[model samples]
Target: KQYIISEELISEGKWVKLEKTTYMDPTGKTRTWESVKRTTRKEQTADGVAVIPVLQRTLHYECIVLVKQFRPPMGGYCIEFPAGLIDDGETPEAAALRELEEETGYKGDIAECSPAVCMDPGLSNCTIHIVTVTINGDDAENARPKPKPGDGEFVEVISLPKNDLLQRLDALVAEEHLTVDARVYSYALALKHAN
Candidate 1:
């Protein structure tokens, strides 16, 4: 599956960058391909990356932070973790924290994060960093999670118990308010219990 892309830095306002790729077949033929590009936090890191953080809430009960929002790419509302991009001078940890705080308003630290994994190697070159976060188990001070203002987000945080999340999630899906993220939902199915 070796392929090469055309050198086109096609740009659009903040929406997306339309780029083209060309691949060389093993049979000895070069052909054109179609693809798109996304901007980074200053390219201080890599050229292609998209991240999603699996935020764990530990205060009062146990559950991972999930969001119900409209995803243009998916063409519908999606249920996913609070996710974002790694900006200039920021590591994956920083990006996870920034995105979690901005999207959920529940502060925490990074528990774990993967190296970097390709999201869709066939159609795109972008990678996704899976970050695990932990909210302190002591919530004597903080209340339920809330969305921060000015971050341009419209989402609801779901901290449903890990034990009954499957049932609750099904209910959410039945109502047509939840379209699951491929990665996040996979994580959900693999959850035997809270980490």
Candidate 2:
């Protein structure tokens, strides 16, 4: 249970530093850990209180599948669901609706919304929420608009049958195309069962 410090290292921007330490493990092993030391980027509004920001995801009931290109972090083009960060002072449901309309040009009511898991618990302190929006096919068609230019975000409307959507869930998972929060597809399956 003894912690030994090796050295202190500063970050590139000088905003943070790390203290390298080593500790003994239960299996008679020594493990190294870095204790991060952070500097304040913004002035504190409140004394002795730290506010951590977070990101969340939501899904509209209708899936928007497109044949557009993508530059993934891992590389190559792949179809992906439209998602964005939740803005400040906004509820998860509201952010979902806003993102859905902005990305897909399909405006509709969010039928149901719920909280989902926080995907990366180790490095990030963010929680994702799910939103299921239901809209008529006609409304989706009518609401469609020309893709905004130069946003680098473009999606083509594809009306996926509920049954087909369920069947493709496994494929999405197998292909590593599914998001961390799978509530969107879960709701789609439930809707398919009800129909």
Candidate 3:
């Protein structure tokens, strides 16, 4: 029982901005909320793309392509699905393919694309499209995949068996002491229960 009355940009930056929103609560009181938003988001389109590249080595030996990189905000390496910001004028599918290849060097075909999903509604207005891709492991090029991450992007590509993804993710946190993205771990949980 709340309605936004108005919003104002409190601060502006190159990549992100802060905003103050005024709303009317159910108790008939005015309230204000401060939130962070992305400045690079293209109007009427997704701001980023998250790719789940499933490698088909065999029907029984399929794996998921994940990436390990140091997230400055986290101050440690995080194991997550290959993802990146969608370039201006780029479709979600195209951005997904490009990002997957750039981050993991595995060329894949789009299997499905999810509608825009919020990343953090309570914190930021950033949204992303989750794309599921299929990588043909039988392809010669994919046999020796070599990632070409962007300058200053040092990423380690990891292929985890789909059958034990969640266990492996937990092991990474317990054994390797790397952070796991919520989305990645959530997907692993879904896969675990769905299987």
lDDT of 2 at 20: 59
Tens digit per residue, CA lDDT, model 3, 109-155: 99999999999898888899999999999989988788763433788
How many steric clashes between backbone atoms does each model show?
Answer: 1, 1, 0
TM-score for each model: 0.78, 0.51, 0.93
Over 34-124, each residue of candidate 2 has an lDDT whose tens digit, in order, gives 5554443233221111111111114334443322234565365444344555655566667765665565555546666554555344432
Name model 3 segments beyond 4 Å from true: 149-152
When 1 and 2 are scored with lDDT, the better candidate is: 1
Taken over the whole model, the C-alpha lDDT of each candidate is 0.66, 0.47, 0.90
lDDT per residue for candidate 1 within 25-140, as digits (tens), equals 87768887666656543553444223343334444446667777888867889887777767777788778877877777877777787777766676665776777777763564
> What's model 2's lDDT at 119?
38
Task: Compute the lDDT for candidate 3.
Answer: 0.90
TM-score of 1: 0.78
Instruction: Please list the Cα RMSD from the true structure of every candidate, rounded to 1 decimal place.
Output: 3.5, 9.0, 1.8
Candidates 2 and 3, the one with greater TM-score? 3
